[PDB]
Design a protein around this nucleic acid. Structure first.
Ligand SMILES: [Mg+2]
Lengths: 681, 105
DNA sequence: TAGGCACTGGCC
DNA sequence: GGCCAGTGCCT
């Protein structure tokens, strides 16, 4: 086993030069440095470890180091270098699995200060290295009377850089040993720093192999990117911007600008007594000025055309135009129309969301109609922000290849669910919401033209069917012998639950259960029956009383955790520990964790089966993973025949997963073909 | 004797009043404003015939103050023939205001 | 007191 | 800068 790290001149996307690398070999216990002219030797040292069937440890190597080496070997040495997945270990991937209850800076992309809770020390040091090396470099120049620029710290190889590289390997090695010391994931009788790769994956907990495969596949997905229609979104922007301009014009005419106190320093004090008046707006007291300009020779002086008079206080003010985006301005204007706020924020301030704006009633006809214009204005700002003006807008992220390469943390949530960001492709407006069809239609394989034939690609949208309910059915099978599962795939589970609860409409059930599965609040539960927070708790109690199997399930899970805790985690399908924050949240955590893990093994197995059928993964091949949004994946395919094989293979893989984990409810998928995301979902 | 203006009566009450008119832009939530209010009552009462004092609450009549670039309140504008002769910001004193008028009247 | 991103406003 | 109260969009 060897531990390694490299320093290059840029991020994956534009990297072009290898600066240095360091290797620590466990079999010789020595550190070897490789400078730029040693790149070839560095690669040979890695391929040697692969020849021995050994392992290479990188921190965040699945997303950067491994792909970067392939790219740099081709560019600088015209050499083909491809490290096999089975020979690579990533301590960042391991950390996210074993320390899933903690957040991370994600290699310094997120500001430490914003993340809640504590952070793993070694991981924090590795993620802060770049920003640290950058500060050392700056002081270096700042001392030599030089000027700093962009990120010149990465343009050239130097000795400070090498020193940090050596430090990254000693820390990565420290993290590794700390991670391997966890008995739950790595049996104690085995020294994992002295085994070949096959023993390593086979003797460790199943979750270790699964997370590494997911990270490798997701890194490839980030590299593929999601084909994006820049022109379509620019034309959508123009349209939204015009509608915004017009809504603003109408609202600024209905609501006029006013004056607000601003720029006051001294406190206003009652001239009579002297009692300070903290409530009154701050004032200002000029020290210069008078009615007449100071004398400078009976004869009348020359008036002072100055506006202030020493000792004569005033309140500084600013002109403020109605901003439909300000909840304060909206709150200010609606009260001045007859609105009496009901709910306030737990910090002195009236709640003004779409929910309440929908129930606001004022006497003035035009003012009442403006509310609908305000709600429209807010939604338009939301869309404009996400697609064009926000810091993470789509138009700011599109790359030259015409694709958006969104980031994905394979294990960003405690339950094993993945998180998406930069930009978050998991929060694109759905087709059922305003402008959703146009937004969704801009993402799709049709926007990618085949590299050889110039023909657009086709898209396959594949979804796991009612995954959460089936997981629930699975877990209650030891209490009901599969009756709930039998009803889901044979009878009608929704009316079954409609009767279980005291709901008037079947659809009310489809909504009730869905809320029940992710653990919705009593309030939202009440809002389906019309009531609120009252009928809420009531229903949940009536439902369980007529569904004993779920109550038994909830009681046995609680027995597992509470005896004061007996253990503060639940075991996932793959054996990992899933932290449980609250006993009442145990069932939800269990269900959510099962779906996440099933979805993870499913997408992994689907790709492995496609590659075993002879299909090549990538735009230079036959198919490309573009998006994984929890229960669904969007796959680009070179042809319709391939899209049909993908859909069929996904079903096969889903069934393989149910069998693999002895699932007590049949699992299924549904696939749809089309040119883009709007049509494939 | 004090005239209470509105956005819509401004043009004719001030700009076309042929005579000296002292306008006071104020707001109910300003300390200094409530300070000079009593003063003005006295001035309008003393300069009856020679001058006319008028008040404009900037919260009920938001469209006029902007046209004159109000940056602080209470603001006093002396109009004469539809044009601004003099201007002064601040809670002047019964005496200070008296000098301001006599000198510009 | 579902779980994650991310936007705009208002402030020191 | 960062920092944060309030909200909405996706599963
Ligand atoms: Mg690195």
């Amino acid at each position: 086993m060897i531990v390694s790290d490299i320093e290059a001149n840029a991020l994956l996307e534009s990297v072009t030069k290898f600066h240095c690398g360091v290797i620590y070999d466990y079999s010789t216990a020595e550190y070897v440095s490789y400078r730029p002219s040693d790149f070839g030797a560095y690669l040979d040292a890695l391929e040697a470890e692969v020849a021995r069937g050994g392992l290479i440890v990188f921190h965040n190597g699945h997303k950067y180091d491994v792909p970067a080496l392939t790219k740099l070997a081709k560019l600088q040495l015209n050499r083909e270098f491809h490290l096999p997945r089975e020979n690579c270990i990533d301590t960042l991937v391991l950390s996210r699995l074993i320390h899933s209850n903690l957040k991370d800076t994600d290699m310094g992309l997120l500001r430490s200060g914003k993340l809640p809770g504590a952070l793993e020390a070694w991981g924090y040091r590795l993620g802060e290295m770049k920003g640290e090396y950058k500060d050392d470099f700056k002081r270096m120049l700042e001392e030599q009377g030089e000027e700093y620029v962009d990120g010149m710290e990465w343009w050239n190889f130097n000795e400070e850089m090498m020193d940090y590289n050596v430090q990254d390997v000693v820390v990565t090695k420290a993290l590794l040993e700390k991670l391997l010391s966890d008995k739950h994931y790595f049996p104690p009788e085995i020294d994992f720093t002295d085994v070949g790769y096959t023993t390593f994956w086979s003797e460790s907990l199943e979750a270790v192999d699964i997370e590494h495969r997911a990270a490798w596949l997701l890194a490839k997905q980030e590299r593929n990117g999601f084909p994006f229609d820049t022109k379509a979104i620019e034309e959508l922007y123009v349209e939204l911007a015009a509608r915004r301009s017009e809504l603003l014009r109408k609202l600024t005419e209905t609501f006029g600008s006013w004056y607000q106190p601003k720029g006051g320093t001294e406190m206003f004090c009652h001239p009579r007594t002297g009692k300070p008046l903290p409530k009154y707006p701050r004032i200002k007291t000029p020290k210069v000025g008078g009615i007449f300009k100071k004398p400078k020779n009976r004869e009348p002086c020359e008036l002072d055309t100055r506006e202030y008079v020493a000792g004569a206080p005033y309140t500084p003010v600013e002109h403020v135009v109605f901003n439909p985006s300000s909840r304060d301005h909206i709150q200010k204007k609606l009260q001045e129309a007859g609105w009496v706020p009901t709910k306030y924020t737990d910090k002195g301030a009236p709640v003004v969301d779409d929910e309440v704006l929908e129930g606001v009633r004022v006497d003035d006809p035009e003012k009442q109609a403006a509310i609908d214009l305000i709600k429209e204005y807010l939604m338009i700002q939301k869309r404009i922000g996400q697609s064009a003006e926000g810091d993470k807008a789509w138009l700011r992220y599109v790359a030259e290849d015409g694709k958006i390469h969104g980031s994905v943390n394979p294990n960003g949530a405690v339950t094993g669910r993945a998180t998406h960001a930069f930009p978050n492709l998991a929060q694109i407006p759905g087709v059922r919401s305003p402008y959703g069809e146009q937004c969704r239609a801009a993402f799709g394989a049709e926007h990618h033209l085949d590299g050889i034939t110039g023909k657009p690609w086709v898209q396959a949208g594949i979804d796991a069917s009612g995954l959460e309910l089936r997981c629930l059915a699975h877990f209650m099978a030891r209490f009901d012998n599969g009756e709930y599962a039998h009803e889901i795939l044979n009878g009608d589970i929704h009316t079954k639950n409609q009767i279980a609860a005291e709901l008037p409409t079947r659809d009310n059930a489809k909504t009730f259960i869905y809320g029940f599965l992710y653990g919705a609040g009593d309030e939202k539960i009440g809002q389906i029956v019309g009531a609120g927070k009252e009928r809420g708790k009531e229903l949940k109690k009536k439902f369980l009383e007529n569904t004993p199997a779920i109550a038994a399930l909830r009681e046995s899970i609680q027995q597992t955790l509470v005896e004061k805790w007996k253990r503060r985690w639940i075991k996932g399908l793959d054996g990992r520990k899933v932290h449980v924050r609250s006993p009442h949240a145990a069932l939800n955590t269990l269900l959510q964790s099962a779906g996440a893990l099933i979805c993870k093994l499913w997408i992994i197995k689907t790709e492995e089966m496609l590659v075993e059928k002879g299909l090549k993964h990538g735009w230079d091949g036959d198919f490309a993973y573009m998006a994984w949004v929890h229960d669904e994946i969007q796959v680009g395919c070179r042809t319709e025949e391939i899209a049909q094989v993908v859909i069929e293979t996904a079903q096969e893989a889903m069934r393989w997963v149910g069998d693999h984990w002895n699932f007590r409810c049949l699992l299924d998928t549904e696939g749809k073909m089309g040119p883009n995301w709007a049509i494939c979902h | 004797k004090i005239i209470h203006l509105t956005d819509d009566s401004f043009d004719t009450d001030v700009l076309k009043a042929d005579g000296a008119i002292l306008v006071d832009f104020w707001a109910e939530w300003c300390g200094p404003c409530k300070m000079i209010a009593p003063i003005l009552d006295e001035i309008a009462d003393e300069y009856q015939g020679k001058l006319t004092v008028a008040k404009l609450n900037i919260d009920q009549n938001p469209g006029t103050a902007p046209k004159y670039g109000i940056r602080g309140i209470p603001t006093l504008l002396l109009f004469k023939n539809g044009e601004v002769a003099a201007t002064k910001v601040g809670a002047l004193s019964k005496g200070q205001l008296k000098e301001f008028l006599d000198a510009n009247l």
